[PDB]
Every structure is written in structure tokens, then in C-alpha cells.
Amino acid sequence: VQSERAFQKQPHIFNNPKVKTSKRTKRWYKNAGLGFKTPKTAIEGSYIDKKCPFTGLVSIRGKILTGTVVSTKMHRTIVIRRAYLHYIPKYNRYEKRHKNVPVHVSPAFRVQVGDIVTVGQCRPISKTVRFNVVKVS
Amino acid sequence: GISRDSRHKRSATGAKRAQFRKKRKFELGRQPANTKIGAKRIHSVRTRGGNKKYRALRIETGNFSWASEGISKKTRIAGVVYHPSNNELVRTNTLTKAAIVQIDATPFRQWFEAHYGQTRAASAKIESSVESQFSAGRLYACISSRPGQSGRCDGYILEGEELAFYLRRL
Amino acid sequence: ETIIERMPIAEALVNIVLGLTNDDITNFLPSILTNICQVLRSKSEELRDAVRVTLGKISIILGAEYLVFVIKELMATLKRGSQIHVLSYTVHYILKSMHGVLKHSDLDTSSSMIVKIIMENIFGFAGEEKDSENYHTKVKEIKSNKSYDAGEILASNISLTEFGTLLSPVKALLMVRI
Amino acid sequence: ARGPKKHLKRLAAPHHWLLDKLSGCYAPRPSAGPHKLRESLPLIVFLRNRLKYALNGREVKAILMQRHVKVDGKVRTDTTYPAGFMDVITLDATNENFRLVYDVKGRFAVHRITDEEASYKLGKVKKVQLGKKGVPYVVTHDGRTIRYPDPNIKVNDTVKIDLASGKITDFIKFDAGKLVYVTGGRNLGRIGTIVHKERHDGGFDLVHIKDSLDNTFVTRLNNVFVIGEQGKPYISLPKGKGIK
RNA sequence: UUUACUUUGAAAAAAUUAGAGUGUUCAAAGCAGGCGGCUCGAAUAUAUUAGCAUGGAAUAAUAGAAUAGGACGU
RNA sequence: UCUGGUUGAUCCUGCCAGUUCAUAUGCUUGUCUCAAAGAUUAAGCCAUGCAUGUCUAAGUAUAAGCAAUUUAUACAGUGAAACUGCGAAUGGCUCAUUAAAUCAGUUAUCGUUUAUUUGAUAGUUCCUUUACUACAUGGUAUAACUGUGGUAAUUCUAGAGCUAAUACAUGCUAAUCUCGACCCUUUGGAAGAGAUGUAUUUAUUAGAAAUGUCUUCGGACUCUUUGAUGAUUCAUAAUAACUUUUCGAAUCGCAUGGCCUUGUGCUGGCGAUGGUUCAUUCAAAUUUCUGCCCUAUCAACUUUCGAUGGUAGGAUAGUGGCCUACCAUGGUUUCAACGGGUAACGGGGAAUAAGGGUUCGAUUCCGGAGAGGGAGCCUGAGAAACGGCUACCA
Ligand SMILES: [Mg+2]
Ligand SMILES: [Mg+2]
Ligand SMILES: [Mg+2]
Ligand SMILES: [Mg+2]
Ligand SMILES: [Mg+2]
Ligand SMILES: [Mg+2]
Ligand SMILES: [Mg+2]
Ligand SMILES: [Mg+2]
Ligand SMILES: [Mg+2]
Ligand SMILES: [Mg+2]
Ligand SMILES: [Mg+2]
Ligand SMILES: [Mg+2]
Ligand SMILES: [Mg+2]
Ligand SMILES: [Mg+2]
Ligand SMILES: [Mg+2]
Ligand SMILES: [Mg+2]
Ligand SMILES: [Mg+2]
Ligand SMILES: [Mg+2]
């Protein structure tokens, strides 16, 4: 959890050393809404992720999309592939098209290449990421 | 000359984009204020709208908080000991947010002695590392303010796991 | 998860409201009855049966003078597809439930609405959908036809002077090829 | 552009004003005010194109600078002042009181009201929130902030505002069976009773409305305005009673 | 079961297009109110795709602890 | 697309001959209504004139201005000049650049600024030099103006002397609310115990079987005590400090009412302009999904000099590789990436057609961009402005 040059912490969550009520450091979390269950690995985890939808400073609002994970080779973000049929009226026929969406995945989730994820829209996280994994399947 | 537009960058595919338009004032940046320890030098900046920012060009004091004791005292900043982004900021003693600095322990020591009557006993007990620092005369603190934005060099005294982490990193 | 358990709360609301002053009754009853009928939009058959029993009990508590309001509310909320079949199944259930409480000529005011539902579900488009072999569904409202029983309930209550309301759609049907 | 626009082409003007296309090149651009640009009737359009008391803009200015026109009980001298839905316009010299309500065509109707009805208006609650020092307040559809509201008042409810004091006299909850007026969309101007509010989290809520002729239609919740209980509105309604 | 598909409903500025009324002297046009309550008057419509709500029994994909099994040890 | 020929007479396949719009141009051209006006891919170059200023009773007049007067006693009618304020960021023009860019429809801001409009909103009583302006502070100050001047020349200005403010800069003046013993039993009195703005930065905290007794039959006796969203570290509140630190009316017109212990005493009407924060409105910046012509004889591209992502900081109004430091090695692509061409601004639309299609859209509305070419800025709520400024190229 502390593999960075700076100390990782949830901002403004204070763990009082003088009191020492509980061994576990105080952990803030929220439920993201829209019927998405907050996983217990987020509630009882130790990870620090400012871009997590359950324990970071990001909210889910906007479009809710679904896709298939096609890449997981970068740290805490994946690439999903969304496929659709585009209609050509001249030939009165369809053609397969796709797009790649880069998504942020919180370390409360485990995703492999091939599984289906539901992602929710959040504020721009990076140059290309505007979505956050809210459910894996 | 600083701009924050994203049009000058390459597309996510790697394509080189062409110039859509000339640079706009609503997407500008300004020169950094490399705040340094010394006599207070602050100049205002007129920002978007009528709003104003404060540029700390130089600063040697700050309001630092002892969170366990729930207090704040104004204190002199001795120097920057560690910075997690760039070591040249430590080399040049540049004050920014998240910098680890050393502060004079005197006002906190005076408050502690006045409040607990000690140099009751259970409440007076504090961490061993913080007390060792008090013996040294300087306390490790983290700057929580943005000096180049608000003109203030506020911060707090390192304690617990954060203090252990930064003692290791030093 | 708890919707079926809470539906009888609507029956409690009708009782306390009916004790209020008449102006308050007119101000609270339409909201309560309307809200129940919207749950019939649900795609859950078990929930739709839970709604149906609460509507039956409320119908006994109320009189036949409120029957016209309920039926017109029911026709407004159920309009397309399987909802048409739910409408006639629920209309019969209310009539079946109110069989003891109903007095002679209580259904005269709502006689015209009932026969339109009855005829549409025997000879109308709804009736054909019940007889269609291509129509594979497990919904009981649609596989079951209660129009015949509703016709018997109606004929037991209608005043003989209004009995031409039943015969007129029959005559119109008989003029066309059958 | 490099800043806010100050003109309005006649073709780009709100259609419901019924401006002649050949009269000129520009329409009166409503000024900032209680109502949005597209949802407002500037006083010039009302005084000249609806009431015909003025033959042109200069006579509208002459009328306004005599302080003859009151909007919600206060004198307005701005020619493009944006009067809107549920606004009361008073002309004392003519002994006239008007309430701005759309007709079934979707256009603001010239609806004359009595001096007793001219004393209040209806405001849809757009927001309920705590202000500084923990004082609650309600924001209505016409931009009125009203402090110390009744705790039962919620968003989408309607409040009855006394114009002389600007205080809430009564309120109506948004609930099934309430009488509602459609203030947007293609059903703008129709009146009916709420049947069901279809809720979608993170999306737009929808309301089913049944008219007196038993016709049903669906509208977004943003376009719905509670005006009373069925069979008893709180305001006099225009001719047609919002039918068809 | 889900999707595709299909039905209905919102949405898709105005002008332009189609359509209704109206002796601009006719016409191209422009235009919304008349009589002293009259049940009088543009009634209006139009848009492939994408997103939103909604009714569907076929068709094409997609799913099932579907019609499964029951012997040993110290 | 049809018509007539090629045979002694037919059918099929071929040959021959005839069969609106756009540009340029020729001749003619009386009357009514109506209406437009591009083009050398030359977004090539421009003489001259005009196209942006603005004053109410209500910011500032001893103009040595004009005119009045019961012929003036601080001023007072009207008012050039100048200061102050606001606007000049709208409008109008053009289509050069631009190929997921603009644009169209559809989203988001729980990711930010917003002059103005509309609605709300700020008694902090006291706290030692009271050695005390609030019946009201300064030049830490000037323009116009007067006068002395430089230059061939410009909406060039220097030295000297004056004088205002809603300019600039300073700075003040016996309250209210909780309980309340005691009396008294209400229209109560009050010994006393307590409490006390905003703005800025940070840290911390909150924000979740009374089913009885009496009573006059009413009612009283004990307890409750934030709200919202699908969702928040939200609204709001509290504690401790902090600040080259804010604000908390030294402003203006009209008028002369009310109390008296008769003092130019106290009080007091209808307005203007300002001012803190919130809301609203006019907006702005970003933003989600889908959708573009030709080219594969362009198959790999991006990443050394940010390309994809992580952590932290800096900058921004604010999210974000937007930039920096340190880390990983990612990102796109035969479902056509990347590169090339475009006589490529996009759309609403126009033409044609029986339908499918195909072409046109600089051009009355909307959106974008530009002001000879690159680049950078001041002021301001708002401009990377060009009928604003600074450089370089021509
Ligand atoms: Mg412009
Ligand atoms: Mg609608
Ligand atoms: Mg003649
Ligand atoms: Mg003024
Ligand atoms: Mg290209
Ligand atoms: Mg103004
Ligand atoms: Mg205001
Ligand atoms: Mg907060
Ligand atoms: Mg950062
Ligand atoms: Mg770098
Ligand atoms: Mg071009
Ligand atoms: Mg244009
Ligand atoms: Mg420009
Ligand atoms: Mg030129
Ligand atoms: Mg300005
Ligand atoms: Mg420029
Ligand atoms: Mg020019
Ligand atoms: Mg210009």
C-alpha cells in the first residue's frame, strides 16, 4: 500500500494515535448509488485509490455502459471493447463496428481478459479515461 | 506562453492533430512561484473573474497544527528535508504542498507544558518519536497548503504511520 | 423484496381516511386508489396477485359508488399487450369479491364499462389472443378467461330496464358475419 | 463570440411570440430576469403585439416610463423585462389584471383576472435547502428565495405566494390525483390529473397525466406544474380549460 | 433470461416543405382572430441513424441444479 | 428515352440519323407587385469619407460660459471641457485553415468562472493611553483650467501654478437572546447564572406497555430536536489558530411630516447609487455516446523531444500528461490505425427522381473560425480583441 514516494492516505480521514480505539485504521467509504453494491473488499480493504468509486473522490453520474475486457496490461486501468452493428441504408444492411474505451478499475475488483464489466461515467481521470468499473461479471 | 489546451497533444491513437484555432486566454497557465524560505514576499495575481490569488514568492512562517492535541500554533519554518515529487526542490529549499519541512518546536512545547504541567500523566503521554523530536528542538511537518495559490504555508505535525514512513524515507 | 408484504398498508389507509371529514375523503381517496392500480403495471405475477387481493378488500370497504372510479382508473393504467388481459382478470376479481356486499342495481352505473371489457375479451382482439396457438406465455391472466363469469355476476345485479345494455353488443355482433 | 450576445434575429426568436417575419430584422431580446429567455414574454411583446395599447416600441417606452405597469405588484420600466408563467401584470389606469398562462395552442393567453386573484401567484418548488446560519429556504420557478418554509414543502410541490409580502400562504404536494398544468413540450398548455410518476434514477422522471376526456399522455417531470386538486384549481383557467 | 429486431411515446429551433382558413381589385404573397354567450375559427403533419421510456407470441443469436447421480474408508 | 432506315416478310443482336440545370454571351426591354446582387481555389492590394459612443431630479462646475433672480452670500437654472462610471467582447463581413476536428442529435458538471437582471441576506453591548473627528478624516492628488515651451510632422506632449468626487486612501459612533430563585398568580415583575460578526488558509468535529396520574374534562405532568440526492468529505453547523487580507454606507435627489421639558433639540417620508454571501437569469469553459468525401501501388503507427497509464507536486476558474519529477510499458490498427488528396467551414436546406439513389449547400437562421502572415499581451465579468497594444516577415 505504501509503494510510492509519498505516503498514501485517504484525505481528511484522521487516525488518532492518542485514542487507539481500534487496531484497524479508520477507513471512509461510500455507496455509489444506482443499485451498485459496494464490495466488502473495498469496505474492509487496505488499498488507497483516489479514483475508486467507493473509497475515492469520484462520483458516478452520466452514462452507464457495458463492455468486454480486452486489455489489463496497465496499472489500475483496463481497455474494454464495445461492439455494435452500424446500418447502411443504401444497401439496407448492417456492418460490425467496435470501439475501445479505457476504463479505471479500482483494486476492489478483479478482472481478466474476457469478462463483462459495467462501467459508470465520472469526471476525466486521465487523458483518455472517463469511466470507472462499477460491476464485474 | 503557457497553455493548458489538449489540442497540441497527439490523439490516443497516436495521430498528429492540426491547429484548430489560435490560443485562447481561457486556457492559460502562469509561471510557477518557487516559494523559498526567507522574509515574507507575496504578490497578488488577478485571476479569471475579478478573483485574486496570492503568490508566495518567499515565506518563513506558517500556522502548523498538532492534530492529536487539537491545536494550531504559528511557527518558523527551518528548512525542507524531503519532497516526494522532486529532490531538487529539497536541494533548493522550495516550499510547495506535501513537502516535509522542519519547524521550530518552541510554541508547541510551551503549550504542552502549560496545558499538562509537565516537561494527567496518562493524557500527557505522547508518541516516543514526537517527544524525541521535541528534545531535538525541531519537529517534522507536512505542508497542507498550496503556497503559490493562497499565499499561506500552513501544515501539520507528522505522527503515527505517516511519521514512521517519512522517518524511513529520510 | 418487501413489496408484497407492504401492499395491505393500502387497506389500512382507506380505513383511516374514511373516518375523516368528507372533504378530506375526496382529497385522499383518489391518491390511494390510483397508487394501488399502478402496481398492476408490474411484471411480477406474485406481486400482481398481492395487489389484486388488496383491491378486493378495499372494494368491500368502499361501496359500488366507488366502483366506477376504480374501473375507469384501471382502464387508464392498463392499455397495451398483456395489460389488457390483466385488466379483465382484475375487473372480474373485484366483482367476484364484492358479490355479497353488492345490492340490486349497484352495477347499473358501471354496466357499460363492464360489457365493453367482456365483449372485447370474448370476440375482440383480446379474445383472439387467448385463442392463438402461436401465443406461448405462462401468465395466468392471459391463459385464463373470466369474461363469462363476469357476465353472470353482472346479470344478477342489473335492473331489468338496463338489461338492453347487454343485448345491444350481442345484436351488433350478430349483424356481422359470425 | 468573445462574450454574451445582445441581439436576437426574428427567425431565431421564440415561435410562440407570433412575430411577423417581414416586420424587421430583430426581435426584442429578453433581458436577464426571473424567467428564461425562451420561456418568457417581454413586456414589449405583451403591450404591443397582444394588447395593442402601443403601436410601436417608442410608445411602449412611453407607457413604461409613466410607471403604469406592475409585474407581480412591482413597477417595471424595462421594455424587454421577461415576464413569464404565472406572472401577474397590472395596469391600474385601465383597471386591468392579467395572469400569464398558456392556451392549448401553447402560446401565452391574454387572461384577465380579478383584483382578488391578482394578489397571489403560484410557484413550483425548484429547490429546498439550508442557507447561511442554518435558515431553510425554497427557490421557486420564478427565482424567488423564500426563507423559513413549511418543513413539509419539498421539490416539485407548489406554493401560494402573496405578492404584497412574498410569503407562502398555502402549498400543494406533488402526488397522484393532483391537478397539473403542462408547461413544456408538445403538450404545453394541457391540463390534467397525475396518474403515475415513472421514476428512473440518474435519468429523467416521467409523469402520466389523464385529462377530463380520459385521454392519457406522458410528459417529463420538468414540464409539469401542480395547480390544484382535481376539480378545484387555485387559479382561474383560460378558455378551454386545457383540453385537446 | 439477455440482445438484435419490431410497436407505441417523448425528442429532433424557427424559416423552408405539405396541408387548413382568409376576394392582397386577381395573383405571387402576407396573415391570425370575428358577432353581441354565439357550441364559430392552422385540425395540423413531416423527418435514416444514435441516445431515452414502452408493448411484443415469430425470426436470428444467447443462456439452464433442463429429462443428473447415489458406491467406498481403518 | 423514343422515332426512321439495314428483309421478299418477322424476332434477336449491332450500325447509322434526329431527339431541364450551370457558365459565358447576343438582341430586345412599356405598366403593377416583389426580390436578389460571391467566385483568378486572388483570406490578392487598397486613395478618400463614414461605420462607437454615452447624462438622470438623483457621482464631480466660482468655465474669467450663457441666462436668470424678490439683483443674489456655501451651492442651487442650463451647461462646453475634464474626472468618475458604463459600453466599445454585441453587431456586420468572409470561408483561409480544419477530416472524430468543426458540426447534428443526445449527455455531464457530485469538475469550474459568471458583469448584469430578479429574489433573499450583514444591530456583533463591552473589552485600560476616554490623552477620544463622527454635527463626518487626509493629499500620502490630480484632470480640465492659468501660464512658460520643444518638434517639419501625429488623437505627440514637457516644466510650473491651481482645485473636486460614488476617483484614491483612511477611519468611528446604552443591544439582543437563553434560562430563571423569589414574589405574584397574570397582558406578570426580575435578584441572578450565562451567550454573542463576516471573508481568507489549514487542522479537527457533527451531519443518526406514561397502554399511567390528575384535571375544571378541556388541559397539564416526562421524552422527542437537523434536511437533500441514485449517490458525496453535500447543504449547514462547531472548535483552534492563521491573513502585507476582505466586508460590515464618511455617497446623492425630492420633500418638510411627528414629538415635546422651545433647543437651528430629538425623530422622521418617497427614491438613486453602492455593498457581503446565497439563489436565479444571460452566459462561458470543459464533457458522454453515435454519425463524415477519395486513397491499401499508404500496413503498421505512437513512444529519444509525453506516446498509454500510476504517485506526488506546479499551473488553471476548475477536471485532465495541461506541465514537471520519479515510476511502469503501455495506446491504436484488415471492423483499415497511421500517412496522403480534397476546386473540405458543418448543419437547417436546394435540385432531380416512380422508388432506391445521386449532385449541390460561400450565400437571409444556428454553430465554428479569421481579420495580410506567425507570435505575445494590457484592460476588463467577458478578448489571446485587431475600426486595442508590442515585436518579427511581407
Ligand atoms: Mg460576433
Ligand atoms: Mg414532451
Ligand atoms: Mg399608371
Ligand atoms: Mg445617477
Ligand atoms: Mg487528413
Ligand atoms: Mg449595465
Ligand atoms: Mg442584487
Ligand atoms: Mg463542506
Ligand atoms: Mg495531480
Ligand atoms: Mg514527465
Ligand atoms: Mg478551402
Ligand atoms: Mg454565420
Ligand atoms: Mg477573433
Ligand atoms: Mg486583404
Ligand atoms: Mg468594459
Ligand atoms: Mg490579434
Ligand atoms: Mg477595418
Ligand atoms: Mg471588431
Side-chain angles (χ1 to χ4, degrees):
Chain A
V1 173
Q2 298 302 338
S3 56
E4 286 287 347
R5 293 208 81 222
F7 182 72
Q8 306 303 304
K9 58 189 299 200
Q10 281 175 323
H12 304 145
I13 313 306
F14 176 63
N15 313 277
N16 188 320
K18 187 178 282 292
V19 174
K20 189 68 180 294
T21 294
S22 177
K23 181 69 175 178
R24 184 182 64 82
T25 61
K26 176 174 253 283
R27 185 167 178 90
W28 174 89
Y29 69 93
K30 65 180 166 78
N31 83 359
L34 292 155
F36 294 122
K37 182 174 72 68
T38 187
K40 293 187 286 185
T41 187
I43 297 179
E44 299 269 355
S46 66
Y47 66 85
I48 297 297
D49 187 16
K50 59 199 282 195
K51 295 139 176 209
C52 176
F54 312 106
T55 68
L57 282 297
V58 299
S59 57
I60 301 299
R61 78 292 176 278
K63 286 179 180 289
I64 301 279
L65 305 182
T66 300
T68 303
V69 185
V70 292
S71 190
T72 65
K73 293 182 183 293
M74 65 183 73
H75 189 246
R76 288 183 172 187
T77 57
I78 61 180
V79 176
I80 70 180
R81 184 178 182 271
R82 302 180 65 242
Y84 54 101
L85 289 187
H86 179 241
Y87 181 64
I88 312 305
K90 177 177 183 189
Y91 300 96
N92 208 51
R93 275 166 181 91
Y94 299 85
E95 84 190 11
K96 286 191 185 161
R97 300 189 163 185
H98 80 96
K99 285 190 198 292
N100 283 17
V101 179
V103 180
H104 185 267
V105 56
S106 162
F109 289 119
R110 296 291 185 269
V111 298
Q112 293 82 17
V113 174
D115 63 358
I116 306 296
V117 291
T118 304
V119 307
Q121 188 183 332
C122 62
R123 65 178 169 83
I125 278 162
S126 62
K127 176 151 186 282
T128 61
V129 175
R130 283 99 175 84
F131 286 92
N132 222 337
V133 166
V134 303
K135 177 168 176 159
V136 187
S137 300
Chain B
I2 310 173
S3 175
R4 325 183 323 276
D5 63 358
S6 188
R7 310 264 199 181
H8 78 281
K9 286 197 81 73
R10 288 191 165 254
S11 172
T13 61
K16 174 82 208 191
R17 296 194 258 250
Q19 184 178 2
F20 171 40
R21 61 184 178 187
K22 317 214 186 173
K23 294 181 176 67
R24 307 301 199 204
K25 199 266 179 188
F26 59 67
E27 61 184 4
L28 66 80
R30 297 190 186 91
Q31 294 297 109
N34 311 274
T35 314
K36 292 196 203 335
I37 295 92
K40 181 175 285 181
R41 193 201 290 131
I42 307 174
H43 77 86
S44 173
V45 175
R46 193 273 194 190
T47 65
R48 186 167 188 88
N51 311 298
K52 68 191 298 163
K53 282 176 190 170
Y54 291 102
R55 290 288 183 203
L57 297 190
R58 195 172 61 180
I59 193 66
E60 72 191 314
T61 56
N63 187 47
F64 292 90
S65 179
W66 204 352
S68 290
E69 302 309 324
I71 55 166
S72 295
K73 292 303 208 193
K74 185 177 180 180
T75 308
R76 183 193 273 255
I77 304 163
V80 186
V81 298
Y82 177 59
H83 190 74
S85 308
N86 188 7
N87 296 115
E88 294 294 328
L89 299 181
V90 182
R91 186 268 186 189
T92 63
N93 296 115
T94 309
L95 295 164
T96 65
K97 179 176 176 176
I100 309 306
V101 297
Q102 263 179 350
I103 65 176
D104 191 334
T106 302
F108 297 101
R109 193 208 73 230
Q110 292 165 356
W111 173 89
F112 186 96
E113 295 162 305
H115 184 270
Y116 290 134
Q118 175 176 348
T119 55
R120 293 182 184 174
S123 66
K125 182 179 181 182
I126 57 167
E127 293 175 273
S128 306
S129 46
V130 183
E131 183 178 1
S132 297
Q133 295 172 76
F134 269 107
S135 173
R138 296 291 185 269
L139 300 174
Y140 288 120
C142 174
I143 298 172
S144 189
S145 170
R146 283 163 65 83
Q149 301 284 316
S150 59
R152 312 284 186 83
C153 196
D154 292 331
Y156 59 93
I157 303 175
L158 294 180
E159 322 190 283
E161 289 214 345
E162 196 166 358
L163 175 57
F165 173 94
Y166 284 114
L167 283 176
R168 283 201 285 293
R169 284 297 173 310
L170 289 170
Chain C
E1 82 190 0
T2 46
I3 184 63
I4 295 93
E5 282 70 28
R6 292 184 273 115
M7 294 299 291
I9 296 173
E11 187 182 7
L13 292 168
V14 176
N15 288 4
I16 66 183
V17 170
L18 285 173
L20 294 168
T21 182
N22 296 115
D23 206 356
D24 290 349
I25 296 171
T26 304
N27 278 334
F28 301 130
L29 266 189
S31 64
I32 297 164
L33 294 177
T34 314
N35 291 346
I36 304 159
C37 292
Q38 303 314 309
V39 187
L40 273 166
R41 295 172 179 269
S42 168
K43 302 293 184 180
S44 171
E45 180 175 355
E46 313 109 305
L47 176 51
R48 262 193 280 95
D49 290 349
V51 187
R52 206 171 288 109
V53 300
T54 302
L55 270 172
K57 294 180 186 294
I58 288 169
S59 77
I60 314 314
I61 296 158
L62 300 175
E65 61 273 7
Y66 290 88
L67 181 56
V68 171
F69 174 83
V70 175
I71 292 167
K72 292 181 181 179
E73 214 68 38
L74 278 169
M75 294 183 286
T77 187
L78 306 164
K79 287 190 181 294
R80 290 229 295 153
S82 59
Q83 289 173 343
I84 298 299
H85 297 103
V86 173
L87 172 59
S88 63
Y89 194 98
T90 60
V91 162
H92 165 263
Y93 183 92
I94 296 172
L95 296 176
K96 180 65 73 176
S97 300
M98 263 197 303
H99 187 273
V101 65
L102 273 163
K103 294 181 176 67
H104 180 77
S105 300
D106 277 19
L107 298 181
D108 287 354
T109 314
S110 50
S111 60
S112 178
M113 294 182 286
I114 296 167
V115 299
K116 295 294 145 273
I117 301 172
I118 287 169
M119 294 299 291
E120 208 276 327
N121 293 312
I122 298 170
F123 309 102
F125 270 59
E128 303 170 11
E129 295 185 9
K130 297 180 180 184
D131 298 353
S132 176
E133 69 278 18
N134 181 92
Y135 182 76
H136 318 296
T137 192
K138 296 174 191 133
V139 180
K140 71 180 173 64
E141 284 78 68
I142 308 154
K143 287 312 174 182
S144 180
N145 189 41
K146 296 288 177 69
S147 304
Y148 298 100
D149 199 338
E152 183 171 349
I153 295 163
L154 193 60
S156 301
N157 189 289
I158 292 296
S159 65
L160 196 62
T161 67
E162 296 191 358
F163 201 89
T165 294
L166 282 55
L167 270 296
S168 307
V170 172
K171 293 185 287 185
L173 183 67
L174 272 159
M175 294 299 291
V176 171
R177 179 184 74 131
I178 188 169
Chain D
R2 291 192 271 102
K5 301 291 187 70
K6 307 175 181 182
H7 294 75
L8 180 58
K9 304 291 180 55
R10 293 185 83 81
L11 290 190
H15 190 199
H16 71 268
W17 293 353
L18 308 171
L19 295 187
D20 297 333
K21 61 177 186 169
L22 311 181
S23 174
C25 184
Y26 302 102
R29 190 181 175 87
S31 54
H35 306 273
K36 308 215 194 85
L37 189 145
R38 317 296 280 171
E39 293 179 353
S40 65
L41 195 67
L43 292 180
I44 180 162
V45 173
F46 184 65
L47 289 171
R48 182 184 58 189
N49 306 138
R50 294 300 101 85
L51 293 182
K52 308 286 171 69
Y53 282 125
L55 311 180
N56 56 9
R58 196 266 306 164
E59 301 193 4
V60 171
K61 185 67 173 181
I63 295 167
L64 285 173
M65 295 302 291
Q66 291 173 266
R67 303 181 66 85
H68 275 152
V69 181
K70 278 186 268 158
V71 181
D72 292 356
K74 291 177 184 178
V75 168
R76 307 303 183 180
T77 60
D78 175 25
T79 64
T80 58
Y81 179 80
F85 183 57
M86 299 292 320
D87 277 15
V88 176
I89 299 171
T90 298
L91 310 175
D92 272 334
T94 57
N95 195 39
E96 265 155 8
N97 290 333
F98 302 91
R99 192 188 287 290
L100 285 193
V101 288
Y102 313 97
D103 55 10
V104 298
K105 298 298 293 295
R107 298 161 226 169
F108 277 116
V110 173
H111 186 234
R112 291 179 176 79
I113 60 173
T114 59
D115 186 74
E116 305 77 56
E117 183 178 1
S119 64
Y120 64 88
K121 70 186 288 182
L122 298 184
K124 167 175 180 181
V125 182
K126 302 300 294 298
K127 189 190 300 189
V128 192
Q129 184 177 2
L130 291 184
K132 302 297 177 181
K133 289 219 262 172
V135 175
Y137 66 89
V138 288
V139 183
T140 63
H141 83 299
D142 52 359
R144 293 172 179 272
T145 297
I146 311 173
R147 314 218 308 184
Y148 298 115
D150 188 288
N152 286 338
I153 294 170
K154 302 298 171 187
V155 175
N156 309 321
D157 299 348
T158 296
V159 299
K160 180 161 163 171
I161 308 164
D162 176 28
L163 300 179
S165 61
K167 295 182 185 294
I168 297 169
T169 310
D170 193 43
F171 66 95
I172 305 158
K173 299 295 293 185
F174 188 103
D175 202 10
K178 298 292 184 181
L179 195 69
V180 294
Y181 183 77
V182 186
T183 61
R186 64 177 316 141
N187 291 315
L188 163 62
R190 294 179 73 171
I191 289 169
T193 60
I194 295 162
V195 165
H196 180 245
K197 178 171 75 173
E198 211 188 323
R199 291 201 65 200
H200 315 270
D201 296 350
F204 299 81
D205 276 29
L206 307 176
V207 189
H208 301 247
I209 297 89
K210 189 184 67 55
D211 63 358
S212 294
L213 303 190
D214 283 291
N215 319 297
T216 305
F217 54 98
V218 189
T219 304
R220 278 194 183 180
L221 175 65
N222 189 359
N223 307 340
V224 169
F225 188 98
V226 176
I227 52 162
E229 289 75 38
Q230 52 195 299
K232 181 266 290 181
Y234 276 33
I235 51 160
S236 47
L237 301 176
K239 280 73 176 175
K241 299 293 183 182
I243 296 299
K244 298 174 184 177

